[PDB]
From a paper:
Shigella causing dysentery utilizes the type 3-secretion system (T3SS) to inject virulence factors into the gut cells. The T3SS needle complex is a syringe-shaped nanomachine consisting of two membrane-embedded ring systems that sheath a central export apparatus and a hollow needle-like structure through which the virulence factors are transported. The T3SS structural core is a membrane-embedded transporter called needle complex, which is an evolutionary conserved syringe-like multiprotein assembly with a molecular weight of about 3.5 MDa. This complex is made of a basal body and a hollow needle that extends from the bacterial surface. The basal body is assembled by the stepwise incorporation of multiple copies of inner- (MxiG and MxiJ in Shigella) and outer- (MxiD in Shigella, which belongs to the family of the secretins) membrane proteins to form their respective rings in the corresponding membranes and periplasm.
The C1 map of the needle complex shows distinct tubular densities at the resolution of 5–6 Å in both the export apparatus and the inner rod and needle, suggesting the presence of α-helices. We used the recently published cryo-EM structure of the isolated export apparatus core from the Salmonella flagellar system as templates for modeling the structures of the Shigella proteins SpaP, SpaQ and SpaR. Random search followed by rigid body and flexible fitting allowed us to place five subunits of SpaP and SpaQ, respectively, and one of SpaR into our C1 map. Five helically arranged SpaP-SpaQ dimers build a turn terminated on the top by one SpaR, which has been suggested to resemble the fusion between SpaP and SpaQ. Analysis of the helical parameters indicates a helix pitch of 19.8 Å and 5.8 subunits per turn, similar to the parameters reported for the Salmonella flagellar complex and for the Shigella needle filament. We found evidence in our map for a 5:5:1 stoichiometry of the export apparatus proteins SpaP:SpaQ:SpaR of the Shigella T3SS. Comparison of our structure with the isolated export apparatus showed different conformation at the inner rod interface, where the N-terminal helix of a SpaP subunit occludes the opening in the isolated export apparatus, while it is bent and moved aside in the needle complex. We built a model for the inner rod fitting in our map a few turns of the published Shigella needle structure obtained by solid state NMR and EM. The inner rod has the same right-handed helical architecture as the needle with eleven subunits per two turns. We modeled the eleven subunits forming the first two turns as alanine polypeptide with helix-turn-helix conformation In vivo cross-linking studies in Salmonella have shown that PrgJ (MxiI orthologue, the inner rod subunit) interacts with SpaP and SpaR.
Numbering used by the authors:
A (entry chain f): 17 to 256
B (entry chain a), C (entry chain b), D (entry chain c), E (entry chain e), F (entry chain d): 6 to 213
G (entry chain g), H (entry chain h): 1 to 86
I (entry chain k): 1 to 19, 63 to 86
J (entry chain i): 1 to 35, 47 to 86
K (entry chain j): 1 to 27, 46 to 86
Amino acid sequence: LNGVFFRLAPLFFFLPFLNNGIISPSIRIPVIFLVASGLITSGKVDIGSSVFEHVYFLMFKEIIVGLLLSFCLSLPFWIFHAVGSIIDNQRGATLSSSIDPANGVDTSELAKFFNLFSAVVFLYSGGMVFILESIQLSYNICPLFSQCSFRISNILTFLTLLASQAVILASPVMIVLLLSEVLLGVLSRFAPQMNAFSVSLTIKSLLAIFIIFICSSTIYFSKVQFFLGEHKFFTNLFVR
Amino acid sequence: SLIATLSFFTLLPFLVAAGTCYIKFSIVFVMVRNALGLQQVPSNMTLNGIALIMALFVMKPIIEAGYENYLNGPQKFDTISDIVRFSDSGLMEYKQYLKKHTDLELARFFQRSEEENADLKSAENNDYSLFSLLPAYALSEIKDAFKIGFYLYLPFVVVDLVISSILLALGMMMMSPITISVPIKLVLFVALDGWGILSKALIEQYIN
Amino acid sequence: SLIATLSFFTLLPFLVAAGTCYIKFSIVFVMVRNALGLQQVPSNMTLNGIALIMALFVMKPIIEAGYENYLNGPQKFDTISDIVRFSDSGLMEYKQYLKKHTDLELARFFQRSEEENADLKSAENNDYSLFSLLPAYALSEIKDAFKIGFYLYLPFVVVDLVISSILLALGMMMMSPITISVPIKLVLFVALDGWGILSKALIEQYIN
Amino acid sequence: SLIATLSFFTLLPFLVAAGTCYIKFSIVFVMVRNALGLQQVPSNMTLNGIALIMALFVMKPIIEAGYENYLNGPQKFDTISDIVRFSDSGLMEYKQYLKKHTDLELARFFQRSEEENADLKSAENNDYSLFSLLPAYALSEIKDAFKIGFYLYLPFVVVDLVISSILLALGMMMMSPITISVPIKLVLFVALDGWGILSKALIEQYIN
Amino acid sequence: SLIATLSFFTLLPFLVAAGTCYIKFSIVFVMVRNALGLQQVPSNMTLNGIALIMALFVMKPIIEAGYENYLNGPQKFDTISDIVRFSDSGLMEYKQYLKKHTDLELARFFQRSEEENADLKSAENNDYSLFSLLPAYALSEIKDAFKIGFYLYLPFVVVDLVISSILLALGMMMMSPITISVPIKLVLFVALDGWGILSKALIEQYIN
Amino acid sequence: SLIATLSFFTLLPFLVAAGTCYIKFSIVFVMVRNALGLQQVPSNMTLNGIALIMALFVMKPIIEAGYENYLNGPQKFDTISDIVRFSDSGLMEYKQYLKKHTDLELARFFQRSEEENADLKSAENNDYSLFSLLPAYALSEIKDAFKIGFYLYLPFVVVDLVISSILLALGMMMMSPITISVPIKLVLFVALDGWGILSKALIEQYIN
Amino acid sequence: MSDIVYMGNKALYLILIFSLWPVGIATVIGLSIGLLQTVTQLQEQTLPFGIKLIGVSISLLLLSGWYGEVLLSFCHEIMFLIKSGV
Amino acid sequence: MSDIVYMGNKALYLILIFSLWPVGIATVIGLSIGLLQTVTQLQEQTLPFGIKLIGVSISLLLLSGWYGEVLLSFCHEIMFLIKSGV
Amino acid sequence: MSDIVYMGNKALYLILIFSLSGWYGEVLLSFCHEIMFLIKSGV
Amino acid sequence: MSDIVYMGNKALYLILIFSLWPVGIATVIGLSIGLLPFGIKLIGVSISLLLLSGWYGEVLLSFCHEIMFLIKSGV
Amino acid sequence: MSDIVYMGNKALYLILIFSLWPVGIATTLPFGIKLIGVSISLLLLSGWYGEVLLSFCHEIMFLIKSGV
């Protein structure tokens, strides 16, 4: 039963912002035995198991499987993270661009609310459900044996539409904020004594928040679209 | 099969803490502690104890059905029957609970995952065994708990954004606004009586 | 039936550390430590140890009531009777304490939660069992300790704001003012006699 | 009755590390690491190891007193008497040290806290029990160590102000002076013999 | 001799992640993230994740050699001895790799600095033990990764220079040009399809 | 008396990592990483790993002294005698090493620290006991390592200041010159063959 | 889905209110003083910042009470719809 | 919640006083010299900063002690009302 | 140090080419691609 | 409280002298030229950090040593 | 202090050299032409400039082992 255990435990830990370190490690371990004691059944094989279990090589294969989904499934959240990130770049966060202060504080500014919104939004249709369905599809495709990783090598080398969907979301945001910065420059040209920190920062911050409102709504609809896109990508990658 | 009962007395309350309750309470308390700055509560003692107390608190009625029918007899001075109907009826109560809060979607999808239920074609959720009942229940509870926790998170992150906004407006490029956020949040957490009301919310209209 | 006394002894210091005190002191001290910059104390050594010492320190008078009535006899060299009135009277003292600092609102909310309380017909607050008494008390102490700590928090945040104001006023945008904050904060922390007044305040006018 | 001696020995070095020294040295070293930029030392290795070494080092006189009177005998090769005067006399040595460096304010406030002290009417500081003595000493040592560390702090902040003022007098607003401070600070830290003098200052005229 | 093999298995993957790969990819992607303004990617989730994924992928062929001669062999259907020659031959493959990419300069300095090789007078690079082999190889990978990383760095710095030139030429002296850099870089980062070229190149024209 | 040797073996590698080497290498590598901008390396993986390898790596000649006198027999396949001359002779080698690199000033100040040393008045540095030897050596190694690291530091900060001077001489007041500094530093870091000379210099002129 | 969107809209609106007022105050301060950094120009570097600080402090003096009230209402409402959030 | 509002108002007023005096001195100095960076302009970059330093230094010399006194009072009160803050 | 000189030569020549606005940005696109090519000529 | 204030006054006076000299040099330069100039200013300021440094550092050096001494009596 | 002082003097002098040449290179229209000059600096000066730092920096680390 261990094999499915180390297909699922990679799944659970590798996929943290669905099931993360907020959850106590004593609650992240039992879900493995749970979902496996579900899944493993009907695979009743009684044969002679190697000395030292040479099928440990098979173990290798299984680990990779779980990891794949997680980082690929991380694309959706991250595109939202990237959106939030770039916006606060023009507002406040990018002032950590300098040599290493104390920690990544300005990560917490904006993108974390996007992470919460996106993670909640799964739970209308499904949080961990579609992931597990695709994983059962992989069980159908590759249950187990010596032939461990068919084409995983070229499956790994791939393209993800991170900034593509980020732009799909934030195009007018970025263009208008660029124009506003150029308006700040026109303000400087009007009077050469502006010392932008005396002027600009407040304006770009307020504008960023307003645009985040309207783009949160557009985010809802673009989110359902993005979910469909990533579903197609995963189907392709696991079948190949 | 008395051995199994007592060795599970040694082991199982952990699996139970992963079994019906103890998930959402601990989760929500960690959500509460991830705001307000640091841990600010002892991770190893306080919140876990609270979760255990509140969880046995929750489950007193299912254990009550068992106390009438199961618990009173396995008092080891009675040398009670091996646990067939004790298990079955306590499981009936546990089943009614689990199905109070288990999604059908997860039920069918994990039934397909097992390859046992997909071939066996189970229709009643009481005909889903506890073995099959566990994982869909846990995941559905996870979804509900995450929903509740982030909806709880909302005002504190609002305060964080507010203070950061004032600072970035004033040119306060260098600051740890989190610390300024640290006090303000709890005012609401205390002044709206939201700790007691939240405990009540989860507690009662979880069971009902 | 000495068994349960010693097993529940092995269990109990955890429940006690979560049951009357030790919440508020650890809370307040981590709150003090989110000022001054870094941890600046060993989270794994010092402050929680201080919390333990002050914990037993504070609980000593309830233990004195039990020392007259309970503790003196279970000294195993006295061969004491089975625990009937030891539990009853120590519970009476613990009850008076818990109800010194428990909200009735939480009492009734967990009464509805348990459904033990609804069927068992609980009228007096001494008729609410200790198990029912525990989590409500924990909630209320959480509220009180939290409020105290964040009302302590605010001034150091004020000082941080002042330092950043001065720096950006002269235009030193690029700075980590926190470090220049570190010394000044200390002076007040020391100049107020503030940790001594904090310990004395919590200690004396927690118990009284 | 060797049991308690060896069990409390297994327990005790933590309470000792919170009991006489180990506070001040770790505090000062963290203050030093708050300058110079990063941690610059492994918090999980170096400063705590140094703290332990220098701690046992500095306690070697108190340990010498307990070594002649207490420690040499419980070496199981002497088959020493049951611990009556070992505890009392080691407590007397710890008492003399503690009263070297404990405030009376803390003593009286914590005496009102225990409420055993109020009823027992303790007048001499040697009549204050060790358990009562410990946390007052801890708080007093905290205050003294804090005062020392921030009086250490002041000059480096002076240097940072100097570097900024020079740059901004030239108008080089866009700079991270911290990094330019990074080398200069160490120079003084080493050039003043400040590492060795700090260690010797704390060490020799801590105990004397 | 299962014991030590399995203990060093519990220990070793960290030293391996510091032993062949995992340096250069992490440094590359961090240099990538130091342009574009903020991190713009999760420091704590994705990028070093990709580093690990590419690392295991890239180390697959050594495991293929050890798959033919070791990882096929432990089977009961192969009737294998305990791990004597499996380790030796896998180490021979690892040796051929490490000596693909280790310097002789670092090797001799590290030989005499261990003084095991200095006094023992080792001649073949296969007679240099794996422990002595690791850190020099790591250093050489560091230097190559740094060359590639800063030669990655140049373009966005050129873009920033251009933006500053524009602003100062038009009299827009007061601006934070970094923000204007953020979108254009992003556009270019996609508009040339360069991330996939970088990743595909790193993987393939590393291993092939 | 095998117990203490093996328990302290479980305990000791930490205290050794704080006891002879492992300080200067890690410190210097962190100094290297505070140049070039960001962390530029994995803090939790690479640099301290290199430090451990280089650490025992470097400690090997003392272990060769023991290999003749100590090490050969505690290979538990030799069934060696109780540790009389193992400790004495390894301590003598450690003594000669520590006295290679311990200052007398620290020795006398910490001797007055221990106050058994002040009462006992030790004159020879071989008459200072091992525990007495440890912390003075720690302090001396701290001073040497810090000197080395910040002397490494100086040129990159020079480069930063010079690029700022260029931009401000051209009137380009608004810039984050650090990023343009990022490539240039690396080339010096390589163009000198300088890391190899650093490692070799640490290497031989540490031990010789 | 829909309820989550309602949550996000309401949250961002509350943020808009509280974060809106002081940042607009700071905007007006900086723009006005920069316009006074014109005729009788008088530019050193930073000066307008000082008034900025004053403004924001006055902001927290002027608005405070009802500001708190806002959160209270919504916060209570949140817990209410907690029982319809499942 | 009324008490919370009173708390915030008090703290912010103390901020007002403490941050009011020194930056007011600096403002006076910079305004005077910047007005002297007009007619007989002679405006290079930084000059008034030097005189600024004098005033600022004297402020941190003269003001400091009693300034801390302000916080002293309020801080003491908090601890007292800690017992009524429960 | 000479290789850095050549890289800066190309980049600063492009800066000269730049310093009309819109299509000017397009110029950067081209060179950016070429940069990554000679990325594998940096080692 | 008073003694701590006296300590801070000493530190601020040392700050005063160190920050007094170079800005006076720059003041002279800027007045004269204002009656381009940044370049001359650069020279002076640069030379200051070269020219004055040693004995200026010495100031801090001396006082810092004294501090550590009375560190022992700060208890 | 002795070696410290020597190190500081030498570093500040190297700073002087590098920060001195670019304005000698430099010796609103003409501003644009001036820009070319600074760029040509990194074209013209860099290599031997680095050599300067290179030399001293190498020696530093060497005499690092004798700087203790």
